[PDB]
RNA sequence: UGCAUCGCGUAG
RNA sequence: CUACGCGUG
């Protein structure tokens, strides 16, 4: 009864939240485009996350998808804002390179803004 | 020589090799090939990958190249075929138009069309009227059908004007309803397949056809873009707010599935935060370069790495053990079982292992076949549907799953929900499919791999539904003895004993075999999981219309079969499989057992000559088989039970979830009437897509010395009171591993510890009537350890550390 | 036996590591898991003795 | 920190 | 029988 309503209460307070985490200027769109308005839910963070994490595990793969600090990803570009390290420090840009790869703890988490 | 043929008359019938421009194979000696592979006789698989340029000879050279868990390169040597069967099948068609223009009816066999797709067969051909002219054409794509999905002979059609050379489809990344594509795919390559078929499964007539029309619906999504699939999600305006909400699903086995309540209280509560939808709204796109899956959303700013901690160490025991002499140089009994600690790429990496679920098709017919023999297995058991006072929950006190866990336990949401409550959940999921997110939770457990150990926490509002669903049926299953399916039977009080002499039944030439299934859970087909819940639903028939029970099945495959997984804060799509932390995942693990089993022995009795057989029943039994095989849409009952009487005569099983029992006879399989270790070999190679080594196989020719192993237990055959009996002792390194290490440090040592030592007690006991005398010195050690324990700890007591105890415990008595 | 004996004390050792917060540092947490993963399932014991000599040694630095 | 099954121990 | 704790797929 009382942890109902507490339960009923946080439940809200997330959807809420997440609400508020939510845009409709990118959503919108695709809802009015779409002929029937039920889009597939995996489109939704392709063509509306502001915001692009990418889990690298070694060098190759970090040079054969976003060396750069600007790269392109789902039919989007994207610019890099910070490269964390598996301890979550801040890798620099400069020290991730295939001298210094055996001195970076990977996976290495690099978190990007769209363009 | 010897060549593959499909052959059907009153003499003779089967599939089977015989003695007997123009290519030298043909098309059934490639599906022979593949649907009867022995990797010591490969020779026609390995001349026909080298003629046309999927692999070279050097490639043979390396072993294990057939295995796809060692080498999954084999897939992409397959795959080089696939084109060729494609345009095979593309002429098919053809020839089927040609004849029906010239009023020529005749039945279509695969071992008359050559591999360059030429057909070459021009007699059982009788002219009729021009237009008029029909082909059989059931047993030439039911057995064909295996290939396609191995060999990917579709790959072509995902790329503009079917041409591989050109660039990909760009389909539109909203759209999702992909019907004319799948009724032209149809058209195009099945056309002359006369049943029925249906894109989206909602419009099916019965559970037989959701099969059907699942088997061409794992074939056809292969080509279509994958985000397409999962939960469709519409914005939705709710007390003037906006929210974004499921309204449907997309499946690659069930097509689209829109929910019939859609509109725009704890119930609704409680389907908004298990719907995945809102998650992976609010969470920051996600690329993992770690796995081959499908990456949806990060939910959290930082990726999490969790670690397993290393098991803690028992000093007194094992001190105790060195002083009383265990644990020496050279002795047999040695520590090989320990906790393994894990880095923190180990939880992704398990889910990495998902990368060996395939897509499958299946011999439908084969498939109908083997799961109305499957049903007979489960004919003694009662189920149905039950109301929310009559579920029975062993425990509270566990997880309740994303985003459930991080408000409280199953005790929460058990005691909040009133029983009416439950009841409008069930209702509304017997109209609507609910998508729900299941956890990877990384277990800690002794073990004698290096491997970790990933299990599925699924969500609250799935397990209730689906107990609400199946419990009456799965308890049926648990208090049923004397049964094949031996879950609830105790190996206690005489149970071994019962069990094995079940088994023993009736068998004329007895032999043992046991079997494993190679990455079973993360290598099972969808088909056959839905096949498994097919089986389990099949009980409803009064209680459950057919729109209900199709809503069920949808909610099932939405939240076990293809759901999605939260893995360190990280949505991810899993492909298929089953999940371990679903309310059916023992009995569907049974039903999935039985029904390779059959389809085992199946595939034994038809591929034997039929001419050579000596025996008329066994001949009779062979062509009817087949008759109803390719031949009869309809249900044969007298047949499916005389099959069956058959089977449990000359065939009797023990199942657990993935453990198996088969007591069979050995001239029969011998003689290829009954399967073997290599039918069951073949099958999973050509259904489960894994390869079984004969290794990890056993065959036991005495029925005296007993399972060489079931439940990881040996059997040894002792004497009790002038009776002798079955007892299982076990793998004694497993014992005392379990008796020095220990997961956390509260039960290291204490007055706890004895109720530990008491039960690993209980469990080694029969190691005494081993005639390895440091088997039995293991039990005697507990005992001492126990005794020991007491003292320090310092008249009921003195049962612990004495043997009477232990030994009521395997006496049948209770 | 001198082969037990390594086993419980790569064990133990790798309990006392853990409680060092060792596994806050990513690459030394693997290290130490790989080397104590190779000694429980090593089969000669001069090779789980050098093992263990590595862990004490990743011990003793610190 | 999952779904079951079986067996123990202590209390009502 | 109920509650709690401990010990195969
Ligand atoms: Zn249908
Ligand atoms: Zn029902």
Redesign the pocket.
């Known amino acids: 009864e009382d942890k109902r309503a507490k339960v009923t209460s946080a439940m809200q307070t997330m959807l809420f939240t997440m609400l508020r985490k939510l845009d409709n200027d990118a959503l919108n769109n695709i809802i009015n485009n779409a002929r029937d308005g039920c889009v597939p839910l995996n489109i939704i963070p392709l063509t509306t996350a502001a915001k692009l994490m990418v889990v690298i595990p070694d060098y190759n793969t970090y040079k054969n998808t976003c060396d750069g600090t600007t790269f392109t990803y789902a039919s989007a570009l994207w610019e890099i804002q910070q490269v964390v390290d598996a301890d979550s420090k801040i890798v620099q840009l400069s020290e991730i390179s295939m001298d210094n790869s055996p001195n970076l703890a990977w996976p290495l988490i690099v978190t990007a803004l769209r363009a | 020589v010897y060549r593959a043929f499909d052959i059907y008359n009153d003499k003779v019938a089967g599939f089977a090799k015989f003695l007997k421009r123009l290519t030298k194979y043909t098309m059934a000696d490639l599906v022979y090939a593949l649907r009867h592979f022995d990797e010591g006789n490969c020779d026609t698989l390995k001349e026909i990958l080298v003629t046309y340029n999927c692999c070279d000879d050097d490639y043979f050279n390396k072993k294990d190249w057939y295995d796809f868990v060692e080498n999954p390169d084999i897939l992409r040597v397959y795959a080089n075929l696939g084109e060729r069967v494609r345009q095979a099948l593309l002429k098919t068609v053809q020839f089927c138009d040609a004849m029906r223009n010239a009023g020529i009816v005749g039945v279509l066999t695969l071992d008359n069309q050559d591999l360059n797709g030429n057909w070459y067969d021009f007699g059982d051909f009788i002219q009729t009227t021009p237009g008029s002219g029909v082909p059989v054409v059931d047993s030439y794509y039911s057995l064909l059908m295996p290939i396609l999905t191995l060999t990917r002979a579709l790959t072509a059609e995902s790329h503009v004007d079917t041409d591989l050379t050109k660039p990909y489809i760009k389909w539109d990344l909203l759209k999702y309803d992909f019907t004319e594509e799948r009724l032209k795919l149809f058209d195009r390559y099945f056309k002359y397949w006369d049943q029925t078929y249906h894109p989206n499964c909602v419009n099916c007539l019965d559970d037989r056809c959701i099969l059907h029309c699942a088997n061409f619906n794992v074939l056809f999504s292969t080509v279509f873009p994958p985000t397409s699939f999962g939960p469709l999600v519409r914005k939705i305006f709710v007390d003037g707010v906006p929210f974004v909400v499921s309204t449907g699903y997309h499946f690659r086995e069930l097509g689209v599935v829109h929910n019939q309540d859609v509109n725009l209280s704890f119930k609704e509560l409680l389907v908004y935060a298990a719907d995945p939808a809102m998650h992976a709204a609010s969470g920051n796109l996600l690329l993992d370069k770690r796995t081959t899956c499908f990456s949806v959303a990060a939910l959290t700013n930082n990726v999490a790495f969790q670690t397993v901690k290393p098991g803690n160490f028992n000093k007194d025991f094992y001190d105790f053990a060195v002083s009383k002499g265990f644990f020496k140089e050279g002795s047999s009994v040695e520590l090989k079982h320990f906790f393994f600690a894990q880095d923190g790429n180990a939880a992704i990496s398990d889910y990495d292992y998902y990368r060996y679920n395939l897509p499958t098709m299946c011999d439908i017919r084969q498939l109908l076949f083997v799961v109305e023999v499957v049903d007979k297995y489960f004919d003694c058991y009662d189920g149905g549907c039950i109301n929310a006072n009559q579920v029975?929950?062993?425990?509270?006190?566990?997880?309740?799953?994303?985003p459930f866990?991080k408000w409280g336990?199953?005790?929460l949401y058990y005691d909040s929900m009133s029983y009416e409550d439950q009841d409008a959940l069930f209702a509304y999921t017997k109209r609507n499919v609910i998508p729900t997110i299941?956890?990877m939770?990384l277990?800690?457990?002794?073990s004698a791999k290096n491997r970790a150990r990933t299990?599925?926490?699924?969500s609250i509002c799935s397990?209730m539904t689906?107990?609400q669903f199946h419990?009456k049926l799965?308890?049926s299953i648990?208090?049923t003895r004397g049964a094949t399916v031996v879950?609830?039977?105790?190996?206690?009080?005489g149970?071994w004993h019962n069990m094995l002499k079940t088994v023993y039944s009736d068998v004329e030439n007895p032999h043992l075999m046991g079997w494993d299934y190679p990455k079973?859970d993360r290598a099972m087909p969808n088909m056959l999981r839905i096949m498994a819940s097919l089986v389990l639903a099949r009980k409803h028939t009064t209680c459950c219309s057919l729109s209900h029970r199709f809503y069920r099945l949808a909610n099932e495959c939405a939240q076990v079969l293809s759901e999605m997984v939260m893995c360190g804060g990280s949505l991810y799509v899993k492909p298929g499989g089953t999940?371990?932390?679903?309310?059916?995942?023992?009995?569907a693990?049974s039903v999935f057992n039985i029904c390779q089993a059959v389809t085992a022995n199946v595939n034994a009795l038809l591929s034997t000559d039929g001419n050579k057989i000596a025996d008329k029943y066994v001949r009779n039994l062979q062509h009817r088989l087949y008759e109803c095989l390719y031949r009869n849409r309809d249900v044969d009952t007298d047949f499916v039970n005389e099959f069956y009487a058959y089977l449990r005569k000359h065939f009797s099983m023990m199942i657990?979830?993935?453990?198996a029992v088969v007591c069979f006879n050995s001239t029969y399989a011998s003689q290829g009437l009954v399967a073997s270790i290599k039918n069951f070999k073949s099958v999973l190679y050509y259904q489960n897509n894994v390869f079984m080594s004969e290794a990890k196989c056993w065959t036991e020719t005495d029925l005296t010395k007993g399972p060489h192993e079931?439940?990881?237990?040996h059997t040894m055959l002792v004497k009790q009171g002038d009776d002798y009996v079955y007892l299982p002792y076990?793998?004694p390194s497993?014992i005392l591993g379990?008796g020095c290490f220990?997961?956390?440090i509260?039960?290291t040592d204490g007055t706890?510890m004895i109720?530990?030592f008491?039960?690993?007690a209980?469990?080694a006991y029969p190691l005494t009537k081993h005639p390895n005398q440091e088997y039995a010195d293991v039990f005697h050690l507990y005992l001492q350890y126990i005794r020991k324990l007491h003292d320090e700890l310092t008249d009921?007591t003195s049962?612990?550390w004495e043997p009477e105890?232990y030994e009521a415990?395997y006496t049948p008595h209770? | 036996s001198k082969m037990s004996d390594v086993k419980c004390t790569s064990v133990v050792l790798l309990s006392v590591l853990q409680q060092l917060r060792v596994e806050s540092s990513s690459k030394l947490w693997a290290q130490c898991v790989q080397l104590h993963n190779d000694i429980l399932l090593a089969k000669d014991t001069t090779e789980a003795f050098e093992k263990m000599v590595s862990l004490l040694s990743v011990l003793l630095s610190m």
């Open positions: 029975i929950v062993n425990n509270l006190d566990k997880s309740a799953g994303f866990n336990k199953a005790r299941t956890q939770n277990k800690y457990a002794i299990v599925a926490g699924v397990t689906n107990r419990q799965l308890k648990a208090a879950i609830g039977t105790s190996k206690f009080y149970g079973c999940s371990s932390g679903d309310a059916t995942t023992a009995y693990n657990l979830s993935d453990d079931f439940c990881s237990q076990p793998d497993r379990a220990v997961d956390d509260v039960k706890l109720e530990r008491v039960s690993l209980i469990d009921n049962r612990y105890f415990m209770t």
